[PDB]
């Protein structure tokens, strides 16, 4: 995607949105970092930075209950 061999999407062909461009700019629409996860929660869904860090933490643990709430 860096060298023009495939269409760049933010992040996926279908599932992309231009509001993710400032977040995903540095990585050409590829989700690389823990910090990008947090910026997506801030920008896309209005999270606080601290609530965003709590989402990333919950994604590490992978618990059944826990996601269900943040998913909402």
């Amino acid at each position: 995607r860096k060298h023009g061999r495939e269409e760049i999407s933010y992040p996926d062909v279908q599932w992309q949105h231009e509001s993710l461009k400032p977040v995903l700019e540095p990585t050409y629409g590829i989700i690389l970092y823990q910090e990008q996860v947090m910026q997506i929660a801030q920008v896309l869904s209005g999270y606080t930075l601290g609530g965003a860090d709590m989402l990333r933490r919950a994604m590490g643990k992978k618990k059944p209950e826990e996601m269900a709430k943040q998913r909402s």
Binding site: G4, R5, E6, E7, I8, K21
Partner: peptide, 9 residues
């Protein structure tokens, strides 16, 4: 021929 390079960005 290089349509895949061309993006609005």
């Amino acid at each position: 021929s290089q349509r895949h390079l061309n993006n609005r960005g």
